[model samples]
Structures are given as C-alpha cells and as structure tokens.
Target: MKKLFLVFWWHMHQPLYREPYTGEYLLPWTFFHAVKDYYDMPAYLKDFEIKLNFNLTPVLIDQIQEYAQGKAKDVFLEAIRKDPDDLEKEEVEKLIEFTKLNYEKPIYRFERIRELMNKEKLNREELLDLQTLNLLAWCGRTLRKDLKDLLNKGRNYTQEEKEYVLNKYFEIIKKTLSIYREIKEEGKGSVSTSPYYHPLIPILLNPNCVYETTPNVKIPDFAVSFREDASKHVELAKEKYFEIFGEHPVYMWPPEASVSNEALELYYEKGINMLATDEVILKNSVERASPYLRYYFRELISVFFRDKTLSDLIGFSYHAWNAEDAVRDFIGRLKKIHESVDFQPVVFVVLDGENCWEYYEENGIPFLEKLYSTLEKEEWIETLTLEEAMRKEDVKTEVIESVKAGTWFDGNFLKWIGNKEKNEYWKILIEAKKKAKNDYILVAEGSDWFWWQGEEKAPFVEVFDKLFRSFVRRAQE
Candidate 1:
C-alpha cells in the first residue's frame, strides 16, 4: 500500500453587513472590493490544482447578491424617478436646503449632509431620486405604516423602468452565482456551509468563561461566546448547505476555528461528520495530554487540525520567504509530521484565500502553483478530502473529554467576545435574541455582529456595530 501522508484543507469566510433600520447596503464598496480583489481572482487557480475545502457564510452570499448586482444602487435610482410626488423626498430636500443655508454655521450640519450625499454618490437631484427608490422598495416589502404617507404620494413607476431595475438586480445575482458555481465545478474542491446569519453560537448561548483567540490577542470570555456561536452556526449551516450545494456537508470549518466540544456535539447533531481546527488547538492538546498518537480525537465527530506553521508560512510569512523556498519548507514540514506520527496524519492548512491574495499582492497565485506542483510530485503525500481520509482510516484513538476554550489565535479567546466592549454589545444582542424566531431569527444571527470589537473604539469597530444595531432594530420590529 502507498504510504498515507498529509490532507490539505483551507477555510474561507466573510461576515454579512446589511443595515436593517435603513434597509441600505452600508459597505457596497467593501463588497465589490473583495469581489474584484479576491473572490473572482483566486477561484481560478491556474498553476496549482489543490483539493481544498471552502466555506461561504450565508450572509456574505446575500450581501453579494444584493449590492454587486446593484439592488442597493437601484434603490436610489427608483427614488429619483418618484421624486415628483414623494412627500419624503420633499422633506429631505427641505432638510438639504436648510443645511445648505447654514453651510458655514457652527453646527457643521451642512458639511455632514454634503458628505453623506457625496459618499453615497447622491447629489441634490440624485438624493431625492435615491430616497424615493429606497422608500418605495422598503414600503413594498415591509408595508411599514411609517412610509404610508410617502407611498400615497408616490409617482407611478414606468413599466420599462421597473423592468430595468428588476433586471439589473437579477443580472447581478446571476453573475455572482455563476462565478460561485463555476468555481465549485471547476475547482472540484469541497464546498462547506456556515450559518445563515453566521452567529458565533457558543457566545450567544453562554457568555460566561469561554476562551477565544485572535491573531493579535486571546481572552477567556470569548471562549464561551464562540462556543454558543458555533452551535448556532451549525444548525443554520446545515440548512444553507442543503440549499446551495444540494447535499449536506460532511466537513465544516467553524468560524475562525473558534470551537469547543459542545460545538462539535452541535456539528454532530447537524449530521456533520468531520471538521477542521487550528494547529495550536491540536498541538497544545496533544502535548499536554497525549503522546505517540496523531489522531487522538476519536469521538462521534472527527476533527482535522490545521498545521499552523505551514499555513502561516503561506498566509503570513510568505512575504518573508521566496515562493519556491516556502513551498519546499512547507513540504518539509509535512515530511516531518509523517516521520513523527505512526498513523497516517491529516495535516490541514487553512487560510483566507481572499486575504492571502491581498497580503501577497497576487504572489499567492504563483505560490499556490508551485505548492500544488510539489504535492503532485511527492509520492508519499496525498491530497484528499476530509471524507476520503476518514474512510481510509479505521485506526481509533481516545477522544479528549473537552477542547480547551480557545480559537485559532494563540489558542485563546479574547479578540471578539471577551472584551468589555464586546460584553456591552452582548447586552444588545440578548435583547434581540429574545424577540428572534423563524426567518427573522436567522437574520438576527448574522456573523458581522460578532466580528469587530463591540466597544466602537477599535479601527474597524464601526462596521460591526452598525450591523448589530441594524439587526437588533429589525428584531424589535
């Protein structure tokens, strides 16, 4: 029999961002940026044909369909069309005029409005139009009484105009879905699912003393948060997996590999047979508890631990090392693992495909090409899906009772849920959870809510806060 070697896996994800109160797409620019930069580019891996698993959170899918297809942009266009008879348009126009009149006043009100309109790409004329479109779209879908007076005075939309906007939206969805389908088909890689809303289930259910990790720092409180979030994610992930891929996923990459035994149980509950975690969790657990055993977790659910050194070399350290040198070093690490372990070990290397491309300034594609070529040449190494690996191996090991509370970051929990800022945000989330049920509940569980430092002090904190607040307000309604 050929020597059993390494199993390579990759994890990819992005949280959803949609403003609930305004029903506006807040980060269309960011969405399109990723599309142009990462999504569309890396899917076409020309040089290296590596079999890897990729996970797409449901919320990101929804946002991509909504904004890039110009669904959000069309809202503004429609408003312009209805400006003639819209009372809201008149009110906004008056507000604009008031601000313009006080342009040099101490309030800086005029400057702010100018900025909003410009940043949103709306001029005076376009502002009225965009708002009209927004109002109509919102009223048509939500039937909110607050928009009743605005709807009553709505100007009639021409059949052609309506068709044009509708077609534009469909065109976007079609193109994006086509790209995703093409990647899935051509790449021949495993496709996994995340929760519909991307909730960090552990944290949502229990906020006590769970450890969570990030690249920068790790904290204890986040562990509980991520645990609950993982559970929530598994349930919705199953539903989404079925909807998109037409079959249940056997493997899952828990958000950031922020998981625990409870999270694994939840995955088992959802029929997931295998999943991946960070190397730190695996190495730390093995060193502290078991030796001479490569595959220690032999529970109902199987775990594939990522090899962080190799993953980071490509993800973070690639810039420092030559592409050919990195590829050689990575393969060397695999050889080292094989020599050290008795059972055929599966060495997962996970990273964000999108982030990697930007980080390497397009060097990632060339590196992948060389790496895949190297793997193809190695007789002792094999690249197989998680399912394939598990089927071949019947060798069992002791199941560790519990995974230490942590994430991929330094094998601790802190970046997301442990901080005081995150706790305050959790209070808002708790209030939202009470009212969440059915479809609305899924929307409330969006992953963006738990991504940033909730305190609004961090650099990108605004992004998460905006999304969480919007979801909460929607839940209240």
Candidate 2:
C-alpha cells in the first residue's frame, strides 16, 4: 500500500544569549532548552529510525561546548551553587523571584518546590530546595536517570546533592550534541546547520526586499545593507558545523524560513542544496492549486514547505488538549490527505524543536511519544527525512525559477521589519555595519530580536527599544 510521505524538520536555535565582555549568559534559555529538547528529541526519536532534520544553530552549538568545557556560568548556576545556610538577603530575594512564572508547570511543578513559594518569605530550606529541583527538572533524559534517586528523595536536599548535579551539568551539555552526532552517524536523519547566529538573510541582503511581500510598505530611512556579510555567516556556519560534528550539513534551514530569489542564490553560492520554508510562501508566490507540493528552484536547489496544520498543532493547539486526543486528531488530518490525493503527496511538518515544549506536560514528552508511537503503526503514513521524501519517484514536484520574498509568519517582513522599533533597529544596523567588522553585529541582526517588537497590541516601545540597544551595546563590547 502506498502512503503519504511525512517530513519533520526541527529547528533548534537561540539568540546571542551570552555577553562577550561579561562572559555570562544574559538569558539562560539555551542551556535549559539544550537539557530538555536537544537531549530528549534525538534520544527518543533515534530509537524508531524516524527521519528528522535537527538544525542546530552555531550560537547554540557553541554554547553547549562552552558549558561542557566548564567555562559557562549564569546567575542560575551561581545562585544554585551557594550553600543554603550562606545565602545573603539579596540571594534569597533573587531565588524567590527566579521561581517559575507559573506553578502549573516548570520549576514549580514539584509539590516541594511549589510549597516553598507559599510562605511570605522563602526561608533558607525553601530557597535551597527550589534551586535544587530547578536544576534537576532541566536535566535531559539520560542525565535525569542518574539523578532519579535524588529526584524521588524530593525534599530536604543537601548542599552535597546540589553540587553533584551542578558538576554533572557539563557532562549533560556536551552529551546533547554528541547524541545528535550519533543520530547522524546512524543515518537516521541529517543533522543540519543554519547560518551562524540565525539572521534573516533576505533582509540582510536588501532592505527593499521588504516591499516584495508588502508593496508600498514604509521604507527605512537608510538602505540597511550588510549584503557582503551574508556569505560570511553561511561560510562560518559550514566550518563551525564541520568543526563540531566532524561533517558539514547537507543543507541549511534559511532561518525563520525567510527566503527570496537572492537568498536562495546566496545559499547555492555557499554550497547548500536544499531549504525548508513555510507553505504560504508557495501559496502566494506560485499560482498552483496544491501549494503544498514540493518544488525545485530550477536546478539550483529544492524546497519543502511545512504542513501548517500538523506543525501548528504541536506548536500551539495540541498541548491544550489530551495528549492522545491530539495525536488522533493529527492522524485524522493526515488520513484525510491520504484519501483525497492519488499521488504520494509529501507532508512536511516543521517547527521550533525546543520552545514549544514548555507549554506541554513533561516538556511535551507524553505527546511526542504518543504521536511517534502511534505514527509507527500507521502504515498509511510514511515518515521520511526531507531528503527521503524528495527521493520518492512519483512525487510530481514542480520547478520554479523565482521565489517571492517572505517568512514563516504571514508571508511578509512585518514580523521582523518595518514596525517603529523594528525599522529603527535596521537603521542602527546599517550604521553599525559600516563601523564594525565583528560577527557579533551580524548575530544582533537576527530575526529573533525583531520578532518581539510587535508582541503587545499597545506600545511598550520604550521598554523594548532599550532592551535591543543594550544587546547591541553589549555585543559591541
């Protein structure tokens, strides 16, 4: 029986989370996400021969090594390492504030950890317990097993156990990347790369390309060109990926699925053969009935647009429902496609591998397991890597010589450009590029920085503008 081919591309990325001068991780997300997603995603999926394109941005890849080498330190680790009895008034205050934002999940999920927050003032015992469980919860599947006894012990954690877990953290950080290498070695999937620091290459090449998506959009006062630096980012990512993983990736995930005619040409120049993009890019750019079809960019490269329904369910909708129910709902959608189409239509499911898990139970472990486990028995669906899905003989792919400028969000530059705060950042970047020759500047220009600009319906522009300026100032330092 023939089946619809499914491709899952997991993009793992983080911003310039570290400060060069201070040598501290300003935001400690990469480390914790490394523990939960990098470790869990590969470790669990590797068992089933499931083909997944796990893209590790160089910023993230480098941080994992920095942590493993025992050179990385954050407020999280520093505060956790302090002996409970020796904590000062300020340290106690910070711990209470650092407790997870919600008790429903995260560091506060444990009964003992939650109990500590109820007191008017968190005591030494409560402070110590919270931080211990905090680090314990962040551990990956493999390292978490080693700490199972301590986790089960739960409360009255001693200074000794905290120290032990902290020491093992370096091991776990390095192990996460090592597991990806193992998956690559097993030929389960291609461990892919992204431009170093994950910038929007289309915008970096030309600011005017913003108008390609939205004609008559407000233009920045300056051109904001860093066209020359575009190649350097791709080149550095290629070298860095080979340096760390002992091999170069087969293709690069154009960050945020931001692609254009010039950007794909840029990728080809950098020796990349394929890229994964969003479905809407094809829907608007090409006049095809099935915009979901696979496409080749003439002869330069091949492109796959993600299946929004399956990807979004995992990213946003699925976690809100019962894990099993969500899995069933997803499969029903896939079965509908299978029945409706005569050809083996490729269904590409792509999303941020790490960020979405926090909204789920057990970092979405149950949901993923249920989904993958059920997917295993469904012979009607064929799980393939992006490469494998393209290999099917009867895929009926079309060839398009031109692609429009767009991103994963709304098929436009509005997500990362042209708003007040976003547009201003582009101008600053133009001047910054003229004066600076550092790679850090290139990183500061990534889409993540601008993605937050339109977050609130109302203006918190002053607050966000300050935050963006601080990162640029620190990155310069």
Candidate 3:
C-alpha cells in the first residue's frame, strides 16, 4: 500500500474584538475561546505522536496575551464578575441571550442549565447559577478536570464559588501560548501566523482584483490601494510572531486563504517559505491541477491546497456523528486514498480550530483523541506537520505562474465584498484611509468586518457593524 501523509492546519483566529477607543472587549469570544479552544488544541497533541500546524493570527496572540497579563476587559467578563444583584437589566438580558446562542448541543447537555433556560425569569441565585454554569459548560477537558468539584456541585453557586472559577479560567488562558511553545520545542508541532489584523491582502492591495474573479462585479465606488498597509501587515505579523514564539514564522495561511498573483509575490518577497489556501485556488489557477501533491507558486513559495471535504467534515459535519464512528469514517477515507495511488500522497486538512468544538461533545476532545490514536496505529498513514511533509524526498511538486483571487468559501472574495451593505462599508474604509491617525484603521481592514456586512446575519453583526464604523471614524480623527 502507498503511504499517506496527513497535514492538519488548525486556523485559530478572533478579529480584534476590543473597542478601539476604550480598550474594552465589546465581544468576549476571544476570551471564551482562549480558556477552551486556544489552550486545548495544542495541549491535546501531548498524548499523540502526530504533528500538525496551529495557524494563529497575530491579533489573536496579542489578545490572548492581554488576557493573561490582566490587561484585557470585556463586557461579558465584566458582567460575569459583577454581583448578580448589581447586574443591570440589560446586562442580564445580554447574558441570557449569549447563553442561548452558545452551541445548542453542549449548552443543553447540562440538565441544570437546560432547566434554567426554560425559566421565564431567573432569580439572582438562578442567574448566578446560569452565569457560572455557562462558563463551566465551555471549559475544555483540562479545565473541566480542574473544576470537577464545582461541576459536581451543579447548582446554587455563591459569589465566592463563581469567583473561584473565574480565577481558574484566567489561569488556564495564561498557559495557552506556552503549550504551543512546548509542542514546538518537542518537534511535535509548529505555530504559524496570518497577516496582522487578518486583512484580505489581495483586496487590500487592489480592490479591483475582485474583477479578476467576477468581471462585472460591483466593487465599492472608490479608488483605494492599501499596498503599503498590506506590506505593513506582513511585516508586523512576523515581528509579533517572533515576539511570542521567539522565531520567525516560516508559514502563513493567507487571511481567508484570499490570494492573487500580486499577493503571492508579496508573501514570497516578505520571506514566508510556505503558504496554504483552498483547493479551489489550485483548481482555478492551473490546468489538470491535482491538489493531492505539493505545488510551488513560481518556485518561490510552497503552496498546500487543503482538502475542503475533509476539513469541512471536521468543521461542520462530524459534530452530529458519534465520535468513534466519525473517526472510523475519517480513517476509512484516508485508507481509500492510500489504496488509489502507487505514489505517496500528502493530504492537508485545514479549518478553524476554535469555533467548531463547542458544537461537539466535550469540546471535540473525544473525536480528536480517537482520530489521533487511530491514525497512530495505521501503518500506511503518517501525520506530519506542513513543514515536515514538504520535506519528503519523493513528493510531487507542480509549479503555477499565478493564482486566482478567492477565499476558502466558494473560492471567491464575495464573502468579504460585492454586496450592498459590504460595499457601503468598503466605501467608508476607503474614505477613512485618506486622513488616518492611528492603526485602528488597519484593524478595520480585517475580513470579518466585511464578513458581517453581507447578506447573512449573526448575533453580533451589529456589534461588528458599529465597530467597523468606529474604526473608520477614529482613524480619520
């Protein structure tokens, strides 16, 4: 049987969730993910011999460190810290809404929290219980072990008990970076970062690049070129990665995997040795493209096209499957690939590491453990980091002169542009660029600001809407 190399790239990111003016976290996702997802993803690798890449955005690293330093504050954290009796009616309502919006399966898994959700009006004691339980439900396997006694108590948590969990929460978040560092030091995994602020480099370089994919598409009615800003983002990301990891990042997952010919040159010139994007990009750029092998863009940088089906299964589908069964199915698929070819093939599975876990049982710890253990036992499969997989002697390499401009979603930038609301915001960003006073304008360039502006709506879209405008306004002043 042919050997199969697996490269898993878990992209961890949170848009700059802080309010530009007050340094307040308008949203608590960054912190919530920190205590659970950020710490757990790398920490889980300890038990397995396999290797993968944790592609973190610089903005996310900065925020996690801020929380660790006791320098970060968010609305949700403040609400949790307040005495239930002192919680404003609005804060209480917001907390309840947030609790409701959490991944339904896990949040409802707890009988007490489930009953609290059914209540018409929660008393202070119930409110306290709900608040603390909300956090308890979100904790990772490790944090859950630390809070075992509190989990058993299950109800009627006092302020002191609640504060105890909150303190423990911060302590876990503090260890997030060191865990990745430890894994790197042991040669089990490597840490990579995206462009600073997670900007769509192609769009930032030239909004007109959108036309390459859709010739008649309506872009924002302005001439804006953030070429300099794009360059700055790449440089700043390398600097921040070095500050945190004590080494230069050798790989970059382009923000949203949005790439163009010009953007490829930028990463190559900026000294990133390898990059990964959606398979759709490789499919669109060259004739008879085979994503199963390694490819180079003009022989300057290595490009890995992720297997969208495999990545999406972990991100969107497997949450509903039995953990062991899902692992069985995943293993079966890899074996099928191994049987299909005489030549060894490297497969890259990349997806958001943080967001999907809440939808799975125990924050996806069970599925990951089963998958890693099963792969370890498979003689035909080898789990390697992207760096290690690229170094294999017999791997096939294809070269592409240029790449199409698109993202992992539908292989287009439409997720971030080409809509009424999205275009209007693009106009604001362009106008704001003229007299910018601070770097918050750069923060405004993140793909998420435009992601929320499009047709579909999410709970915190308005928060993003207001935040985007605030950046534009603040930068101009």
- CA lDDT of each candidate? 0.54, 0.77, 0.85
TM-score, one value per model: 0.68, 0.93, 0.97
Order the candidates by TM-score, highest first: 3, 2, 1
- Scored against the true structure, residue 33 in model 1 reaches a CA lDDT of 35
Which ranges of candidate 2 are over 4 A from the true structure? 100-102, 457-471, 474-477
lDDT of candidate 1 at residue 261, scale 0 to 100: 60
- Model 3 CA RMSD to the hidden true structure, in angstroms: 1.4
Across 1-477, the per-residue lDDT of candidate 3 in tens digits comes to 568888988999998887878878899989888888888888878878888789989999889989999998788899988889999999999988887787376634777887888899989999999888887877877877778889888888999998999998899988888998888888888778999999999987777778777787788766656999999999999999999789898889898888888898999899999899998877877788767888888889888898888889999999999999999999888888777766888889999998888888877888988998888898878888767876886678878788888888887888778867778888888888877878878888898888887586678887887788878888887
Q: Show model 1 residue runs off by greater than 4 Å.
A: 1-4, 33-49, 67-70, 74-187, 209-232, 283-298, 394-398, 435-447, 454-460
Score candidate 1 by lDDT.
0.54
Instruction: Identify the candidate with maximal TM-score.
Output: 3
lDDT of 1 by residue, 167-208 (tens): 443343446555555556664456666655655555555444
| lDDT winner | 3
Cα displacement (angstroms), candidate 3, residue 377, comes to: 1.1
